[PDB]
C-alpha cells in the first residue's frame, strides 16, 4: 500500500529527526585528535624500516 | 626452506596449483552464454527445447528464490553453458556487469507483440551500449515467427501505428524467404530485423556484432545456430588477436 | 539529495498542446542523460523520450514521433517536454527520469517499477 | 651467398700461385 | 490521503536539513587548514597472487593479518598466505557467480554469496581435513552483495532486494531484517564494537542500523548516484562512502551530515571499493580506471596512486595491523602493497 | 665454393703426382727435367723446341677463359734460367692470368644487402624477444610461439654471421702469406662438420618453426580448444626436435658415403633429397594453410559485415601481414640468366635476409598489446 508506505516513511523520519547532533567543529576536532593520537602506529602513513616488514 | 612446516606448505600449494591446472582446462573449454528476454519472449520454451542436447544428488526442486538457472547443453562436444536470471529485481544495472566475460548474450524477443516491441528495442539498446558489455556480441532470436505471420495474414493489426516507418519500407533485396510466405509477412519480419540491426550497426565499432535469427516455435536447430554463431565469434576474436581482421 | 519535480500536467482537449517542466536538484544536471517516461492507467511504465548531456542526441518513441519535443536547459537545471496534438491514448502519469550514472550512454532501469532517481509524476488527462 | 667464398678462393689460389709457383 | 503524508515528509525533511545546517558552524577544511600534509605516499607491489581464472569480485583479510580469502567468478574461493604467496585453500563453489566473500574473526569459517541469493558458510577446520559447506542461508530475494561475520554464529548479509539481514548460522533462520533502502544494497561495514553497521545502497544513500535493536538510526545522503563502497572510520564515529559519481564522501554519525568530499576533475570513473588506514589518516579508494587513489582523509588532498592492475579494481582492504594493502581486480590477480 | 675448389685441387694433384711417380723419364741427354711446383705439372718437354703447355685447369676461374697454352722452350744443354739471377723459372708460366655478369655489381652488392639485412633482423629480433619476455602481461601461448620463432631466426642469422666471420678469419690468416691451416681444417672434425651441421639444423629449425606458427594459427581458427600444455609441448617438440630427425641422418650418412670435406659438395643429386624434401614439405603445408586462413578472412569480410571497397583494401593488408609470418614467399618465387639471374638472386635472397626484421616489426612493434603495455609503463613512470 502506497499510503501505508508513506505513513511508515513519515514515522521513520520522525524517529530520525529527534536526535542529538553535536557541532561539526567538535567532530572535526575529534577526528583530528584520533588521527594525531594514532599517527605513530600507522605503517602505511609512516613506513616501518625493512626489518619489521614481513612482506619485504 | 626450513623443512617440515615450510615443506608442508609449499607442497600443499603445489597440490592445489595442480588441481587448479586441471580445472582451468575445463573452464577454458566451455562457453558461457547469458539468456535475456521478456516474460512474453519465450526463453523458457527455447531453454526447454535445447535441454535435450546435454543429500539428494538430482535435486529437481531448486529453491523458491533461486536467482539464477543453469542449462548445460553439448553440441559437437563443445559443452555450452547458458545462464538465465531468475529471482532478481526489476533493476539490472548492477548484476548485469558480472556477465562481462561471456561468449555470447542470447537476446530473445517476441516479434509478434508490437505492443511492447519498443521495450525490446530499448533494453537491446541499453545492453548494446554498455561500458562492460561493449565487447560482448549478441545472438538475437526473433521468437514466435508463426504468431507474427498469423497476425499479419489475419489483418486487423495495423503495425504502421506502432512504428510510423513501415510505410516507407521495402523488403531488403537480400531477403531469403521460405517458398510459402506472403510478401507482407516477409516485409514485417525484415522490418523488425532491421529495427534491431539499425541499433546494432550504429555505434559498436567492430568489437562485437549481432547474429539475428528467425525461430518461431518448433525450430530444433537453435542449439546449432548458437554453435555456429559462437564459432564465428571465437574465430573472429582469434583473427583480431593476429591483426588479420 | 537527488530530487526531481514535474509540473504542467492538467486536463486538455484533444489536439491541444501541453508543456511539462522538470526542475532537478541535488546533482549536476549537465552531466546526466535525461528521460521522459509515461505510465498509462492499467498498464506499465513506458519510455517516451531521451536527451543527452549536451542536448545534441535526442530520441523519441514511435507513438510520439513528430508530436513531442524534448529539450534541456543546463544553466537553469530544467528539462522541458512540449506535447502537440494530444490524443486520448496519451493520458498518463509522466515522470522525469535520470540516467543512473554520469558520462554514460546506457540508461538502465529508467523504466523500472521502483527506480530511485525518478520524479513523483504529473497527471496528464486528455 | 657465394660472393665471399668465391672472392676468398680466388685470393687464395692467386696468393698460393704468386708466392710459390 | 497521500498528499498530506507527502507534505508531512517534506516538512520533516526540511526540519532535519535546517537542524543539520544549524549544526554546521565550521567545515572540516577550516579546522584542518593548518595541519602538516602527509606528502606523497609511495607504495610498491610487495606481492602478487595469481591462480584465479576469471575476474576477482571480492576479498577479505584475516584477523591474523596474514591469510586472506579471495572470491573469483570462475567459481573459486582461494585462501592465501600473503607472507609467502602459498595457497592454503582452494574451495570450488556450487555457483560461479560469486559477488562477495568474508572471513570469520576467529578464522574458523569463511562465507560467500552472489547471484544465487544464498550465503554459503564454509568450515575450514573440519576433523577430516577437507573443506565442506557448513551452512547455506537462504531467504534473500535478490543477489547477495556483502556479508560480514559478527562472530562464529552471527552474520549480516545485504542483498539486492533492498534489504539487509542478521542471521543465525547454527539455526539458519533470519534473526533480524533491516528494511528501508529503496535500491540495491551494495555494501555494509561493521563498527569496531559490532553493535551498529552502515549500509550503502543504490538509492544514493547510506543508513546506520542497530544490530541488537533492528531500526535505522540515521540516514545520510549527499551522493549523486549509486554507492558501491562503505567503510567505518577506525574509531567508529565516522564512515567514508565511494559512489558512481567519481567522488568519495566522509560522513560523521554524531554531526549527522557529510564532512568531507574527495573529488577530482580528472576522475570521472566511479569508486568500486573504499578502505581506511590503521590511524584513519589515509583513505584508499579503488576506481574503474584501473588505479587506486590514496587520499588525505583530513585535508581532502590526493596523496598517492597505486597503479599496476590491468582491469577494473573491484576489491580493496587493509590489514588489521595496517601493515599492507591488498587490491584485487578484474584482471584476476591480487596485489599486496606496502 | 672454396671447399669444392680445394677438393678439386687435391684430386688433380693426387692424379698428377701419381702420373709423375708412375711415368719413367725417357732417359735422354740434354733434356728438360721433371718437377712439381703446386701450380702446374712440369714433365720433360721436347729438346730444341718451343712446346706449348696447357694452363692449369683446377682453378674455378679457368672455365670462362679457353684452353690457353704457354710456350716453353727446351734447349740442348738442360740448363735453366732465373729472373734477376735470384729465383723463378724466367718465364713460361705468366700467360695464364687474364682476370676477364661482373663480380662487383652482381656479387658485392648482393652480399652487402645480405649482411646488412641479417644484422638489422638480428638486432630487431633481440629487441623483440626482450620486449616479449620483459612484460608479464604478454605471456600467452601465442607469444611463446613468437619467442621461439624469434629465437630460430636469431640462430639462423648467427650461423650465417659465424660462417662469414670464419671465412674472413681464414682469409686474414692467409694474408700473412703463410700458416696453411686450411688443410688441417679439412679434417672434418671441428673446423668443418660441426659448423655445416649446425647451419643446416638452424635452417631446418627456422623452416619448421614457421610451420609451427602456421599450424597453431590454423588450429586456433578451425578445430576447437584443447589442453594448453599438451599443445605447447607438441609444438615445441615438432619445432625444435623434428629437424633433428632428418639432419642427424644426413650428418651420419654423409659421414660414410660422401665424406669428402665437411659434405659441402653434393656430387649425388639424390643425396640432397634427405634435407631438401623435409624442408619443402614444411614449406608446402604452410602454403595450404596460407590459402585456407586467407579464405577464412575473406569469409569474414564478405559476410553480413558491411560491404564496401574494404573487402579488397583490408584483405590486401591482411595477406601482406601473413606473408612474413608463414614464410609464404618461398613458394611464390621457388629462369635465371643475366638480368633474370640478378633479379632471382636479389629478391629471394633479400627477402630471406629481411624476413626476421619484418616479423619482429609486425608482431612485436606494431602490435597493439605491446604498444598498450609500453604506454601503460610510460604513464606509470611519468608520476614516479
CA distances for F330 relative to B90, B204, F157, F207, F351, angstroms: 62, 40, 18, 10, 9
List own/partner pairs for E168-174 with CB under 8 A and 24 or more apart: E169/E109, E169/E121, E169/E134, E169/E135, E169/E137, E172/E135, E172/E136, E172/E137, E174/E139
Spell out the domain ranges in chain C. Answer: 3-124
Task: Name, in order, each residue with C-beta under 8 angstroms of E124's C-beta and a sequence gap of 6 or more.
Answer: E79, E89, E107, E108, E109, E110, E131
Domain C3-124 CATH assignment equals 3.40.710.10: no
**How many beta carbons lie within 10 A of that of residue E5, not counting itself?**
18
Looking at the DSSP assignment, which residues form a beta bridge with residue C71? C80
Please list the helix, strand and coil fractions of chain B in percent, rounded to the nearest 5, in that order. Answer: 40, 15, 45
Residues of chain D neighbouring F37 (CB-CB closer than 8 A): 20-21
CA distances for E85 relative to E75, E80, E117, E321, F136, angstroms: 20, 6, 31, 19, 18
The rounded distance, in Å, linking the Cα atoms of F182 and F204 is: 28
| Touch F-B: 3+ C-beta pairs under 8 A | yes
Cell of E152: 562464529
Looking at the DSSP assignment, which residues form a beta bridge with residue C82? C19, C69
The rounded distance, in Å, linking the Cα atoms of E19 and E11 is: 12
Length of chain F: 384
**How many beta carbons lie within 10 A of that of residue B215, not counting itself?**
21
What is the radius of gyration, based on Cα positions, of chain A? Answer: 23
The rounded distance, in Å, linking the Cα atoms of B150 and F8 is: 93
Task: Name, in order, each residue with C-beta under 8 angstroms of F304's C-beta and a sequence gap of 6 or more.
Answer: none
Cell of B22: 586441471
* 3-state SS class at B44: helix
Residues of chain A neighbouring E26 (CB-CB closer than 8 A): 23-25, 28
Interface test with A, best of E281, E285, E336 (most A CBs within 10 A): E281
Q: Looking at the structure, do residues F56 and F118 belong to the same domain, yes or no?
A: no
Backbone phi, then psi, for E336, in 5-degree steps?
-105, 120
DSSP string, E43-77: --EEEEE---SS-EEEEEE-TTSSEEEEEETTTEE
CA distances for C41 relative to A5, C38, C89, F159, angstroms: 21, 10, 10, 85
Q: Would you say the C-alpha torsion C43, C98, C87, B157 has a positive or negative sign?
A: negative
Q: Would you give the distance in Å from CA E102 to the centre of its chain?
A: 11
List own/partner pairs for C69-78 with CB under 8 A and 24 or more apart: C70/C36, C72/C29, C72/C34, C74/C29, C74/C30, C77/C23, C77/C24, C77/C25, C77/C29, C78/C21, C78/C22, C78/C23, C78/C24, C78/C29
* 3-state SS class at E162: coil
Cell of E225: 548516484
Q: How many CA atoms lie within 13 A of C73 on its CB side?
A: 10
CA distances for F61 relative to A30, B89, E281, E299, F66, angstroms: 101, 92, 88, 89, 11
Q: Which of the 8 DSSP states describes residue B213?
A: E
B186 closest CA partner among B152, B213, B156: B152
Asked if F37 reaches chain D (Cβ–Cβ under 8 Å), the answer is: yes
Please list the helix, strand and coil fractions of chain C in percent, rounded to the nearest 5, in that order. Answer: 5, 45, 50
Residues of chain E neighbouring F379 (CB-CB closer than 8 A): 307
Q: Would you give the distance in Å from CA E172 to the centre of its chain?
A: 24
Binary contact (B239, F368; C-beta < 8 A)? no
Cell of F292: 585456407
Q: Would you give the distance in Å from CA E104 to the centre of its chain?
A: 15
Asked if B244 reaches chain E (Cβ–Cβ under 8 Å), the answer is: no
* Pick among 3.90.1310.10, 3.40.50.300, 3.90.25.10, 3.10.510.20: CATH of B33-241: 3.40.50.300
Backbone phi, then psi, for E266, in 5-degree steps?
-70, -30
Asked if F109 reaches chain D (Cβ–Cβ under 8 Å), the answer is: no
Task: Name, in order, each residue with C-beta under 8 angstroms of B67's C-beta and a sequence gap of 6 or more.
Answer: B85, B86, B87, B88, E115, E116, E117, E118, E142, E143
Residues of chain F neighbouring E307 (CB-CB closer than 8 A): 379-380, 383
The rounded distance, in Å, linking the Cα atoms of E60 and E112 is: 11
Tell me the H-state helices in B50-182: 117-128, 145-154
Residue F368 covered by a domain:
yes
Spell out the domain ranges in chain E. Answer: 2-337
Q: What angle do CA B184, B188, B189 make, to 5 degrees?
A: 115
Task: Name, in order, each residue with C-beta under 8 angstroms of C72's C-beta and a sequence gap of 6 or more.
Answer: C29, C34, C51, C55, C78, C79, C80
The rounded distance, in Å, linking the Cα atoms of E276 and E61 is: 13
Binary contact (E224, C103; C-beta < 8 A)? no
* 3-state SS class at D19: helix
Asked if E99 reaches chain B (Cβ–Cβ under 8 Å), the answer is: yes
Using an 8 Å CB-CB cutoff, list residues of chain C that contact chain B: 46-47, 61-63, 65-66, 100, 104-109, 111-115
What is the radius of gyration, based on Cα positions, of chain E? Answer: 20
What is the nearest CA distance from A34 to chain E, expressed in angstroms? Answer: 7
The rounded distance, in Å, linking the Cα atoms of A10 and A6 is: 6
Looking at the DSSP assignment, which residues form a beta bridge with residue C49? C36, C60
CA distances for F87 relative to D21, F33, F42, F91, angstroms: 11, 17, 17, 11
Residue F97 covered by a domain:
no
Burial of residue C54 (number of CB atoms within 10 Å: 0-12, 13-18, 19+)? exposed
F217 closest CA partner among F125, F288, F316: F288
Burial of residue B143 (number of CB atoms within 10 Å: 0-12, 13-18, 19+)? buried
Q: Which of the 8 DSSP states describes residue B96?
A: G
B27 closest CA partner among E117, E76, F136: E76
Cell of F2: 672454396
Characterise B211 by phi-psi region: left (phi > 0), alpha (psi -120 to 50), beta (else). beta
Looking at the DSSP assignment, which residues form a beta bridge with residue E230? E241
Question: Is the distance from CB of E188 to CB of E198 less than 8 angstroms?
Answer: yes
E289 closest CA partner among E316, E269, E319, E314: E269
* 3-state SS class at B237: helix
Question: Is the distance from CB of B130 to CB of B204 less than 8 angstroms?
Answer: no
Question: Is the distance from CB of A27 to CB of E31 less than 8 angstroms?
Answer: no
Q: At what angle do helices B222-241 and F273-301 cross, to 10 degrees?
A: 120
Going by their DSSP bridges, the two strands C45-51 and C34-39 should be labelled as antiparallel
The rounded distance, in Å, linking the Cα atoms of B111 and B147 is: 8
Binary contact (F2, D12; C-beta < 8 A)? yes
Number of domains in chain F: 2
The rounded distance, in Å, linking the Cα atoms of B103 and B231 is: 10
Q: Which of the 8 DSSP states describes residue C76?
A: T
Indicate the helix (H) or strand (E) that contains E6: helix E2-22
Domain E2-337 superfamily per CATH: YVTN repeat-like/Quinoprotein amine dehydrogenase (2.130.10.10)
Q: Looking at the structure, do residues F254 and F217 belong to the same domain, yes or no?
A: yes
CA distances for A3 relative to A42, E1, F327, angstroms: 52, 7, 78
The rounded distance, in Å, linking the Cα atoms of E48 and E331 is: 12
Indicate the helix (H) or strand (E) that contains E78: strand E76-81
Asked if B115 reaches chain C (Cβ–Cβ under 8 Å), the answer is: no
* 3-state SS class at C78: strand
Residues of chain F neighbouring B31 (CB-CB closer than 8 A): none
Cell of B6: 615450510
Q: Looking at the structure, do residues F131 and F59 belong to the same domain, yes or no?
A: no
Looking at the DSSP assignment, which residues form a beta bridge with residue F231? none
The rounded distance, in Å, linking the Cα atoms of F360 and F228 is: 24
The rounded distance, in Å, linking the Cα atoms of E208 and E221 is: 12
Q: Looking at the structure, do residues F88 and F110 belong to the same domain, yes or no?
A: no
**Exposure string for B71-106, b = 16+ CB within 10 A, e = fewer:** bebebeebebbbbbbebbbebbbbbbebbbbbbbbb
Q: Which of the 8 DSSP states describes residue E288?
A: T
Burial of residue B231 (number of CB atoms within 10 Å: 0-12, 13-18, 19+)? middle
CA distances for C126 relative to B132, B242, C45, D5, angstroms: 42, 61, 18, 100
**CATH number of the domain enclosing F20:** 4.10.1240.10
Q: Looking at the structure, do residues F206 and F82 belong to the same domain, yes or no?
A: no
* 3-state SS class at B46: helix
Q: Looking at the structure, do residues F196 and F306 belong to the same domain, yes or no?
A: yes
Cell of B180: 510459402
E174-179, strands of its sheet edge to edge? E144-149, E154-159, E163-168, E174-179
Residue F121 covered by a domain:
yes
Please list the helix, strand and coil fractions of chain E in percent, rounded to the nearest 5, in that order. Answer: 5, 45, 45
Place of cell 624469434: F150
Q: Would you give the distance in Å from CA F211 to the centre of its chain?
A: 20
3-state secondary structure A28-45: HHHHHHHHHHHHHHCCCC
Place of cell 501505508: A4
Residues of chain F neighbouring E310 (CB-CB closer than 8 A): 137, 376
Going by their DSSP bridges, the two strands C58-60 and E144-149 should be labelled as unpaired
**Exposure string for C97-125, b = 16+ CB within 10 A, e = fewer:** bbbbbbebbbbbbbbbeebbbbbebbebe
Residue F98 covered by a domain:
no
The rounded distance, in Å, linking the Cα atoms of E8 and E229 is: 32
Q: Would you say the C-alpha torsion C94, C99, C105, C109 has a positive or negative sign?
A: negative
Q: Looking at the structure, do residues F371 and F310 belong to the same domain, yes or no?
A: yes
Binary contact (B235, F220; C-beta < 8 A)? yes
Task: For B100, name the nearest residue in chain E, comparing CA atoms only.
Answer: E55
Indicate the helix (H) or strand (E) that contains E112: strand E109-114
**How many beta carbons lie within 10 A of that of residue E127, not counting itself?**
6
Range of the domain at F357: 103-383
Task: For E8, name the nearest residue in chain A, comparing CA atoms only.
Answer: A10
Question: Is the distance from CB of E67 to CB of E80 less than 8 angstroms?
Answer: yes
Q: What angle do CA C94, C96, C101 make, to 5 degrees?
A: 145
The rounded distance, in Å, linking the Cα atoms of A1 and B104 is: 41
Q: Which of the 8 DSSP states describes residue C125?
A: B
Binary contact (B27, E89; C-beta < 8 A)? no
Length of chain C: 126
The experimental technique behind this entry is cryo-EM
3-state secondary structure chain F: CHHHHHHHHHHHHHHHHHHHHHCCCCCCCCCCCCECCCCCCECCCCECEEEEEECCCCCHHHCCCCCCEEEEEECCCCCCCCECCCECCCCCCCCCCCCCCCCHHHHHHHHHHHHHHHHHHHHHHHHHHHHHHHCHHHCCHHHHHHHHHHHHHHHHHHHHHHHHHHHHHHHHHHHCCCCCCHHHHCCCCCCCCHHHHHHHHHHHHHHHHHHHHHHHHHHHHCCCCCCHHHHHHHHHHHHHHHHHHHHHHHHHHCCCCCCCCCCCCCCCCHHHHHHHHHHHHHHHHHHHHHHHHHHHHHHHHCCCCCCCCHHHHHHHHHHHHHHHHHCCHHHHHCCCCCHHHHHHHHHHHHHHHHHHHHHHHHHHHCCHHHHHHHHHHHHHHHCC
E80 closest CA partner among E321, E276, E274, E319: E319
Task: Name, in order, each residue with C-beta under 8 angstroms of E263's C-beta and a sequence gap of 6 or more.
Answer: E246, E247, E248
Q: Which of the 8 DSSP states describes residue B57?
A: S
* 3-state SS class at E273: strand
The rounded distance, in Å, linking the Cα atoms of F279 and F314 is: 31
Amino acid at each position: 500500500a502506497s499510503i501505508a508506505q508513506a505513513r511508515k516513511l513519515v514515522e521513520q523520519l520522525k524517529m530520525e529527526a529527534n536526535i542529538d547532533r553535536i557541532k561539526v567543529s567538535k567532530a572535526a576536532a575529534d577526528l583530528m585528535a584520533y588521527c594525531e593520537a594514532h599517527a605513530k602506529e600507522d605503517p602505511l602513513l609512516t613506513p616501518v624500516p625493512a626489518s619489521e616488514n614481513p612482506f619485504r | 626452506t626450513l623443512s617440515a612446516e615450510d615443506k608442508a606448505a609449499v607442497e600443499r600449494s603445489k597440490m592445489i596449483e595442480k588441481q587448479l591446472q586441471k580445472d582451468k582446462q575445463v573452464y577454458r573449454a566451455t562457453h558461457r552464454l547469458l539468456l535475456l528476454g521478456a516474460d512474453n519472449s519465450g526463453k523458457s520454451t527455447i531453454v526447454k527445447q535445447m535441454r535435450i542436447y546435454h543429500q539428494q544428488d538430482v535435486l529437481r526442486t531448486r529453491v523458491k528464490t533461486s536467482g539464477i538457472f543453469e542449462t548445460k547443453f553439448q553440441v559437437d562436444k563443445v559443452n555450452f553453458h547458458m545462464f538465465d536470471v531468475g529471482a532478481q529485481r526489476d533493476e539490472r544495472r548492477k548484476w548485469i556487469q558480472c556477465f562481462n566475460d561471456v561468449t555470447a548474450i542470447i537476446f530473445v524477443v517476441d516479434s509478434s507483440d508490437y505492443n511492447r516491441l519498443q521495450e525490446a528495442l530499448n533494453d537491446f539498446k541499453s545492453i548494446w551500449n554498455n561500458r562492460w558489455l561493449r565487447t560482448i556480441s549478441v545472438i538475437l532470436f526473433l521468437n514466435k515467427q508463426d504468431l507474427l505471420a498469423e497476425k499479419v495474414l489475419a489483418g486487423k493489426s495495423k503495425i504502421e501505428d506502432y512504428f510510423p516507418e513501415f510505410a516507407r519500407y521495402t523488403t531488403p533485396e537480400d531477403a531469403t524467404p521460405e517458398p510459402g510466405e506472403d510478401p507482407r509477412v516477409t516485409r514485417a519480419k525484415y522490418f523488425i530485423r532491421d529495427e534491431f540491426l539499425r541499433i546494432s550497426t550504429a555505434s559498436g565499432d567492430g568489437r562485437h556484432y549481432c547474429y539475428p535469427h528467425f525461430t518461431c516455435s518448433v525450430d530444433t536447430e537453435n542449439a546449432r545456430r548458437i554453435f555456429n554463431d559462437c564459432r564465428d565469434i571465437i574465430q573472429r576474436m582469434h583473427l583480431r588477436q593476429y591483426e588479420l581482421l | 539529495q537527488v530530487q526531481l519535480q514535474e509540473s504542467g500536467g492538467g486536463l486538455v482537449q484533444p489536439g491541444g498542446s501541453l508543456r511539462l517542466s522538470c526542475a532537478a536538484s541535488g546533482f549536476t544536471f549537465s552531466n546526466y542523460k535525461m528521460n521522459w517516461v509515461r505510465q498509462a492507467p492499467g498498464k506499465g511504465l513506458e519510455w517516451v523520450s531521451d536527451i543527452s548531456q549536451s542536448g545534441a542526441s535526442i530520441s523519441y518513441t514511435g507513438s510520439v514521433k513528430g508530436r513531442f519535443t524534448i529539450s534541456r536547459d543546463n544553466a537553469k537545471n530544467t528539462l522541458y517536454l512540449q506535447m502537440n496534438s494530444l490524443k486520448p491514448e496519451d493520458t498518463a502519469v509522466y515522470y522525469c527520469a535520470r540516467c543512473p550514472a554520469p558520462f554514460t550512454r546506457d540508461c538502465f532501469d529508467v523504466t523500472s517499477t521502483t527506480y530511485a532517481y525518478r520524479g513523483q509524476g504529473t497527471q496528464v488527462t486528455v | 651467398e657465394g660472393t665471399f667464398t668465391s672472392d676468398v678462393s680466388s685470393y687464395l689460389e692467386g696468393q698460393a700461385a704468386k708466392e710459390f709457383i | 490521503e497521500l498528499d498530506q503524508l507527502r507534505q508531512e515528509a517534506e516538512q520533516l525533511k526540511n526540519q532535519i536539513r535546517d537542524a543539520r545546517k544549524a549544526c554546521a558552524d565550521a567545515t572540516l577544511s577550516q579546522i584542518t587548514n593548518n595541519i602538516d600534509p602527509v606528502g606523497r605516499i609511495q607504495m610498491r607491489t610487495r606481492r602478487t597472487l595469481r591462480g584465479h581464472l576469471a575476474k576477482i569480485y571480492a576479498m577479505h583479510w584475516g584477523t591474523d593479518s596474514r591469510l586472506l580469502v579471495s572470491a573469483s567468478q570462475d567459481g573459486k574461493l582461494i585462501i592465501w598466505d600473503s607472507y609467502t604467496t602459498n595457497k592454503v585453500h582452494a574451495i570450488p563453489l556450487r555457483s560461479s557467480w560469486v559477488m562477495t566473500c568474508a572471513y570469520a574473526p576467529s578464522g574458523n569459517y569463511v562465507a560467500c554469496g552472489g547471484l544465487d541469493n544464498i550465503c554459503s558458510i564454509y568450515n575450514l577446520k573440519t576433523r577430516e581435513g577437507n573443506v565442506r559447506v557448513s551452512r547455506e542461508l537462504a531467504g534473500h530475494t535478490g543477489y547477495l552483495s556483502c556479508c560480514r561475520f559478527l562472530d562464529d554464529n552471527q552474520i549480516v548479509t545485504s542483498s539486492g532486494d533492498t534489504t539487509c539481514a542478521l542471521w543465525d548460522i547454527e539455526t539458519g533462520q533470519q534473526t533480524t531484517t533491516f528494511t528501508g533502502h529503496t535500491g540495491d544494497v551494495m555494501s555494509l561495514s561493521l563498527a569496531p564494537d559490532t553493535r551498529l553497521f552502515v549500509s550503502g545502497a543504490c538509492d544514493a544513500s547510506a543508513k546506520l542500523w542497530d544490530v541488537r535493536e533492528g531500526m535505522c538510526r540515521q540516514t545520510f545522503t549527499g551522493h549523486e548516484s549509486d554507492i558501491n563502497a562503505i567503510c567505518f572510520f577506525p574509531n567508529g564515529n565516522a564512515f567514508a562512502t565511494g559512489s558512481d559519481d567519481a567522488t568519495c564522501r566522509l560522513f560523521d554519525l554524531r554531526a549527522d551530515q557529510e564532512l568531507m568530499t574527495y573529488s577530482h576533475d580528472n576522475i570521472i570513473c566511479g569508486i568500486t571499493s573504499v578502505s581506511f588506514s590503521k590511524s584513519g589518516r589515509l583513505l584508499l579508494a579503488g576506481y574503474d580506471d584501473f588505479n587506486c587513489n590514496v587520499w588525505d582523509a583530513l585535508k581532502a588532498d590526493r596523496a598517492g596512486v597505486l597503479a599496476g592492475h590491468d582491469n577494473r579494481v573491484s576489491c580493496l582492504g587493509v590489514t588489521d595491523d595496517g601493515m599492507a594493502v591488498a587490491t584485487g581486480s578484474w584482471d584476476s590477480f591480487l596485489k599486496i602493497w606496502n | 665454393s672454396l671447399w669444392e675448389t680445394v677438393q678439386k685441387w687435391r684430386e688433380y694433384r693426387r692424379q698428377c703426382q701419381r702420373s709423375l711417380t708412375e711415368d719413367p723419364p725417357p732417359a735422354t741427354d740434354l733434356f728438360c727435367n721433371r718437377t712439381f711446383d703446386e701450380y702446374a705439372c712440369w714433365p720433360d718437354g721436347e729438346p730444341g723446341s718451343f712446346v706449348n703447355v696447357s694452363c692449369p685447369w683446377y682453378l674455378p676461374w679457368a672455365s670462362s677463359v679457353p684452353q690457353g697454352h704457354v710456350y716453353r722452350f727446351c734447349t740442348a744443354e738442360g740448363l735453366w734460367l732465373q729472373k734477376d739471377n735470384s729465383s723463378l723459372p724466367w718465364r713460361d708460366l705468366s700467360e695464364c692470368e687474364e682476370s676477364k655478369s661482373s663480380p662487383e655489381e652482381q656479387l658485392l652488392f648482393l652480399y652487402i644487402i645480405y649482411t646488412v639485412g641479417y644484422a638489422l633482423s638480428f638486432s630487431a629480433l633481440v629487441i623483440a624477444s626482450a620486449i616479449l619476455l620483459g612484460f608479464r602481461h604478454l605471456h600467452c601461448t601465442r607469444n611463446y610461439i613468437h619467442l621461439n620463432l624469434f629465437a630460430s631466426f636469431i640462430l639462423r642469422a648467427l650461423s650465417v654471421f659465424i660462417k662469414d666471420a670464419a671465412l674472413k678469419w681464414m682469409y686474414s690468416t692467409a694474408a700473412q702469406q703463410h700458416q696453411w691451416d686450411g688443410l688441417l681444417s679439412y679434417q672434418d672434425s671441428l673446423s668443418c662438420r660441426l659448423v655445416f651441421l649446425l647451419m643446416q639444423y638452424c635452417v631446418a629449425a627456422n623452416y619448421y618453426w614457421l610451420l609451427v606458427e602456421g599450424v597453431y594459427l590454423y588450429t586456433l581458427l578451425a578445430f576447437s580448444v584443447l589442453s594448453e600444455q599438451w599443445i605447447f609441448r607438441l609444438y615445441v617438440s615438432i619445432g625444435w626436435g623434428v629437424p633433428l630427425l632428418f639432419v642427424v641422418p644426413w650428418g651420419i650418412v654423409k659421414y660414410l658415403y660422401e665424406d669428402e670435406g665437411c659434405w659441402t659438395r653434393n656430387s649425388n643429386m639424390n643425396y640432397w633429397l634427405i634435407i631438401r624434401l623435409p624442408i619443402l614439405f614444411a614449406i608446402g603445408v604452410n602454403f595450404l594453410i596460407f590459402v585456407r586462413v586467407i579464405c577464412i578472412v575473406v569469409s569474414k569480410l564478405k559476410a553480413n559485415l558491411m560491404c564496401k571497397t574494404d573487402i579488397k583494401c583490408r584483405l590486401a593488408k591482411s595477406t601482406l601481414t601473413l606473408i612474413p609470418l608463414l614464410g609464404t614467399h618461398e613458394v611464390i618465387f621457388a629462369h635465371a640468366r643475366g638480368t633474370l639471374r640478378f633479379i632471382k638472386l636479389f629478391t629471394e635472397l633479400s627477402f630471406t635476409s629481411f624476413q626476421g626484421l619484418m616479423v619482429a616489426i609486425l608482431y612485436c612493434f606494431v602490435n597493439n598489446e605491446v604498444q598498450l603495455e609500453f604506454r601503460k609503463s610510460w604513464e606509470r613512470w611519468r608520476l614516479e
